[PDB]
RNA sequence: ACGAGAACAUGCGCGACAUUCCGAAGAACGCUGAAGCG
C-alpha cells in the first residue's frame, strides 16, 4: 500500500549532516524512521509493528509543478551538469534511464528545481553571563521552503501499519523533524494520500533497480547484490537521541549504507540495524530498501 | 531513540557637538483750499 506523505514546512528546519552549522535539504530514511520511534514511544505506541512492517522511502523535493527522485547511478557515455543535476522530475527520470536526457537538458531540469534557500542563523549562549563569563556566539543551519514547494516520501505497508503511520506522521507535525527542533525550527504540516502516479512508476520491470531510500543489506544479500552495482556508500553517524539511553549523551555505532539513488542489478532486502552499544535501550537504525524497476 | 540535546545576537553604549533666518534698504514722488459769483 504505496501511500505518498507531502510535508509542508511552515518555519525554516535544519536537517543537519556533519555539524550544526551545515543544513540539508531533505533528510534520509533512517531519520525519519528514528523520529517515528520516537514518536511512537512517546504515544505510547508498540515499536515492533513499525520497525517489522514498514519500509520507508527518504524524504525528496517537490514543487506545484513537479515531484524530484534522485539521480539514478548509472553509466553516461557534459558531465558537470550531470554532477549538478541530482534530483529529476519523474517523467523526466524514466527518459533519463533511457538515457535521451543531454547535457543541456539536464541542466535545465537542475535548474528547475525551486525547493527553497538554505541559509544560516547566527544565535549565541548567554548562560555563562549570568555566572561571571562571556556569551558564546553559534550557528545554526537552516533550509526555508519556497511556498509551493515541500518535501515527500513514499510509504509501503499493511493497513494497520498505514494507520499507524498516520497517527504517528500528525504527531509529527508538531514534534517536528531535524535539528534544533523545540528550539524554533522544524515545524510542518503533512498530508497522507495515495498517489496514483508514484504506484505507476513503483510498478515497472527493468533490467535496473535503483535505492529510493538509504539501506545496506546483510552479508549473505551482500554477496550476491554488490557485485555489478553502481552505488554510493554514505556514513551514518550520530549522537543517541533518549533520556533512557545512559545518564549522559553517547554516540551511536558508526553505520555505512548505500545511498538513495544508487543503482543494484539485483535487489536486496533491507534490515533494521542496531548501532548501540553498551546502552540501556537498543538504538534502531533504518536501512531497509525501497526498490524502483527501470530500464537502461 | 532525528549530527542530536540543551544554548536570548546579546551586553555597554544621548543622532550629538559648533551655528544670530541675518546682510543692504527714507512710506515718498508729484499735488496753491481753490474756482465761479450770485
Given at each position: 500500500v504505496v501511500k505518498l506523505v507531502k510535508l509542508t514546512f511552515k518555519s525554516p528546519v535544519?536537517?543537519?549532516?556533519?555539524?550544526?552549522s551545515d543544513s540539508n535539504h531533505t533528510i534520509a530514511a533512517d531519520t525519519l524512521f528514528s523520529a517515528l520511534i520516537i514518536e511512537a514511544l512517546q504515544q505510547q505506541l508498540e515499536l515492533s509493528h513499525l520497525l517489522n512492517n514498514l519500509v520507508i522511502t527518504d524524504l525528496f523535493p517537490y514543487n506545484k509543478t513537479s515531484y524530484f527522485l534522485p539521480k539514478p547511478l548509472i553509466r553516461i557515455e557534459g558531465y558537470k551538469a550531470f554532477k549538478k543535476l541530482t534530483y529529476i522530475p519523474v517523467e523526466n527520470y524514466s527518459e533519463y534511464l533511457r538515457g535521451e536526457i543531454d547535457s543541456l537538458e539536464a541542466s535545465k531540469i537542475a535548474e528547475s528545481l525551486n525547493l527553497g534557500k538554505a541559509s544560516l542563523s547566527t544565535k549565541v549562549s548567554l548562560q555563562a553571563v549570568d555566572h561571571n563569563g562571556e556569551s558564546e556566539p553559534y550557528s545554526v543551519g537552516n533550509f526555508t521552503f519556497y511556498p509551493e514547494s515541500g518535501l515527500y516520501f513514499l510509504a509501503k505497508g499493511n493497513a494497520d501499519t498505514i494507520g499507524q503511520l498516520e497517527i504517528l506522521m500528525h504527531a509529527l507535525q508538531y514534534?517536528?523533524?531535524?535539528?534544533?527542533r523545540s528550539a524554533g525550527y522544524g515545524q510542518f504540516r503533512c498530508t497522507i494520500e495515495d498517489s496514483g502516479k508514484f504506484d505507476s512508476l513503483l510498478s515497472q520491470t527493468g533490467n535496473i533497480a535503483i535505492l529510493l531510500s538509504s539501506a545496506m543489506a546483510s552479508d549473505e544479500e551482500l554477496v550476491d547484490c554488490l557485485e555489478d552495482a553502481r552505488y554510493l556508500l554514505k556514513k551514518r553517524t550520530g549522537f543517541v537521541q533518549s533520556k533512557?539511553?545512559?545518564d549522559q549523551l553517547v554516540k551511536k555505532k558508526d553505520f555505512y549504507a548505500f545511498s538513495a539513488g544508487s543503482t543494484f542489478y539485483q535487489k536486496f532486502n533491507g534490515k533494521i540495524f542496531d548501532v548501540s552499544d553498551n546502552g540501556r535501550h537498543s538504538v534502531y537504525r533504518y536501512a531497509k530498501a525501497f526498490w524502483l524497476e527501470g530500464k537502461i
Amino acid at each position: 500500500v504505496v501511500k505518498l506523505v507531502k510535508l509542508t514546512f511552515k518555519s525554516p528546519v535544519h536537517f543537519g549532516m556533519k555539524r550544526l552549522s551545515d543544513s540539508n535539504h531533505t533528510i534520509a530514511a533512517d531519520t525519519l524512521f528514528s523520529a517515528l520511534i520516537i514518536e511512537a514511544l512517546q504515544q505510547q505506541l508498540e515499536l515492533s509493528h513499525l520497525l517489522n512492517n514498514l519500509v520507508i522511502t527518504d524524504l525528496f523535493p517537490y514543487n506545484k509543478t513537479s515531484y524530484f527522485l534522485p539521480k539514478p547511478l548509472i553509466r553516461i557515455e557534459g558531465y558537470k551538469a550531470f554532477k549538478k543535476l541530482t534530483y529529476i522530475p519523474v517523467e523526466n527520470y524514466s527518459e533519463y534511464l533511457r538515457g535521451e536526457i543531454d547535457s543541456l537538458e539536464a541542466s535545465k531540469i537542475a535548474e528547475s528545481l525551486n525547493l527553497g534557500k538554505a541559509s544560516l542563523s547566527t544565535k549565541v549562549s548567554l548562560q555563562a553571563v549570568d555566572h561571571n563569563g562571556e556569551s558564546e556566539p553559534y550557528s545554526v543551519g537552516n533550509f526555508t521552503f519556497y511556498p509551493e514547494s515541500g518535501l515527500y516520501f513514499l510509504a509501503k505497508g499493511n493497513a494497520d501499519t498505514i494507520g499507524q503511520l498516520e497517527i504517528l506522521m500528525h504527531a509529527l507535525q508538531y514534534s517536528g523533524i531535524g535539528g534544533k527542533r523545540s528550539a524554533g525550527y522544524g515545524q510542518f504540516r503533512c498530508t497522507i494520500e495515495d498517489s496514483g502516479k508514484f504506484d505507476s512508476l513503483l510498478s515497472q520491470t527493468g533490467n535496473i533497480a535503483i535505492l529510493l531510500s538509504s539501506a545496506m543489506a546483510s552479508d549473505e544479500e551482500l554477496v550476491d547484490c554488490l557485485e555489478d552495482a553502481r552505488y554510493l556508500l554514505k556514513k551514518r553517524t550520530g549522537f543517541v537521541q533518549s533520556k533512557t539511553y545512559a545518564d549522559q549523551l553517547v554516540k551511536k555505532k558508526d553505520f555505512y549504507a548505500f545511498s538513495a539513488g544508487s543503482t543494484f542489478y539485483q535487489k536486496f532486502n533491507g534490515k533494521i540495524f542496531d548501532v548501540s552499544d553498551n546502552g540501556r535501550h537498543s538504538v534502531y537504525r533504518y536501512a531497509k530498501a525501497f526498490w524502483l524497476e527501470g530500464k537502461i
